[PDB]
Structure 1
Amino acid sequence: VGSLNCIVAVSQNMGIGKNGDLPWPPLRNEFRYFSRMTTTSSVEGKQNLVIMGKKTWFSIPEKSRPLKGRINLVLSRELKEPPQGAHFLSRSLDDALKLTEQPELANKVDMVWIVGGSSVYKEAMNHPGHLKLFVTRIMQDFESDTFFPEIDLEKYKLLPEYPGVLSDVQEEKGIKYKFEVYEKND
């Protein structure tokens, strides 16, 4: 299995969600960024795996689930089987990551992308080892009821360039945003 990664879009006040959806109106090219990053795999005959909590799964429009071209894993201790349209179910982050090492997945999975929500981001960001964060900074405050955990910049370096990630200010629907990639190894 390849690299471990988180991807998120976050407002200035650290918001990632409100009432089961995003705090901001749809940013179509920001969504396309999410799909390009999470779907694109450099390794032949492999796909990337997405790991998400149960509320994040149900926050994706049903017409867009499962996230196409990716293996979709949902984290839940209450569910007894994957949701309709999902591929796998795990009861912990450690279990999910171990699953990628099993024979059914060992030679199929390239990158792993954690796509939230707040509890899984926090646990992933604090788990020793090599991890990158692909963070979209939405440069406004938005009322939110779900927040991104603290990024400890003593361990996560903001990278000064990354191939394929635009460096300049983007804007859609009157909302400016910019892309960032962080990396730790501990």
Structure 2
Amino acid sequence: VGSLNCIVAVSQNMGIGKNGDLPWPPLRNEFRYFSRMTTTSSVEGKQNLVIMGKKTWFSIPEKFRPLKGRINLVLSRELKEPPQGAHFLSRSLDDALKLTEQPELANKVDMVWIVGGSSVYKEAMNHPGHLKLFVTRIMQDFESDTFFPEIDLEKYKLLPEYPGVLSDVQEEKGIKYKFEVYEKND
């Protein structure tokens, strides 16, 4: 199994969601960036795995579920089987990560991408080990009801460049944003 990563787009006030959708209007190229990063596997004969909470799963429009070309794992203690369209169900992050090493997935998974929501991000970011955060900074405030957890910059070093990540300011629908990559290893 390859790298562990989180990916998120986040407003200035740390907002990631409102009423089960994004706090801001659709940003087509930003969605493209998400799809590119999570889908692109460095390793032949493997796919990336996406891990997400139950509400994050249901927040993705049905026509885009499962996230194509990726193995889709949902976290839930209430569900008894994976939602329609989902590939796997785990009762915890540690369980999901363990599963990735089992016979059914050991040979199949390249990178793993935590795609939300708040509680999965928090546990992942606070768990010792080698972890990257792909963070898109939406450079405005947006009314939100769910928030990205604090990034501890003592741990998470902002990388000065990363291959395939544009460094300049992007803009769609009058909203400026920029891409960042953070890395910790503890």
TM-score range, shorter chain: over 0.9
Does the alignment pair 1:176 with 2:179? no
1:6-52, CA deviations, whole angstroms, 9 ceiling, x for partnerless residues?
00000000000000000000000000000000000010000000000
Aligned-residue offset at 1:161: 0.2
- Cα distance between partner residues in 1 of 2:20 and 2:131: 27
Residue 37 of structure 2: aligned partner: 37
**Identical residues among aligned pairs (%):** 99
| Number of residue pairs aligned between Structure 1 and Structure 2 | 186
State how far apart, in whole Å, the 2-side matches of 1:93 and 1:104 are.
Answer: 18
CA distance in 1, matches of 2:176, 2:125: 26
Whole-Å separation in 2 of the counterparts to 1:42 and 1:49: 13
1:116 & 1:48 partners in 2: Cα distance? 16
**Distance (whole Å) between structure 2 residues aligned to residue 94 and residue 183 of structure 1:** 20
- Residue matched to 1:123: 123
TM-score by length of 2: 1.00
Matched residue of 1:180: which SS?
A: strand
Partner Cα separation in structure 2 for residue 120 and residue 42 of structure 1:
25
Query: What do the CA deviations read for 1:59-95 (whole angstroms, capped 9, x no partner)?
Result: 0000000000000000000000000000000000000
**Aligned residue in 2 for 1:88:** 88
CA distance in 2, matches of 1:38, 1:58: 18
- Matched with 1:21 is 21
Alignment of 1:1-186 (within 5 A): 1-186=1-186
Shift of 1:103: 0.2
Q: Distance in 1 between matches of 2:153 and 2:144?
A: 23
Per-residue CA shift, 1:109-168, capped at 9, x if unaligned? 000000000000000000000000000000000000000000000000000000000000
List 4+ stretches of structure 1 deviating above 6 A.
none
CA distance in 2, matches of 1:5, 1:107: 19
Determine helix, strand or coil for the equivalent of 2:110.
strand
Distance in 1, matches of 2:64 and 2:92, equals 24
Q: 5+ unaligned residues in a row in structure 2: which ranges? A: none
Secondary structure at the aligned position of 2:57 is classed as helix
Partner of 1:105, secondary structure, is coil
> Aligned partners of 1:59 and 1:50: how far apart in 2?
15
Q: TM-score, normalised by structure 1?
A: 1.00
Q: Over the residues paired in the alignment, what is the CA RMSD in angstroms?
A: 0.2
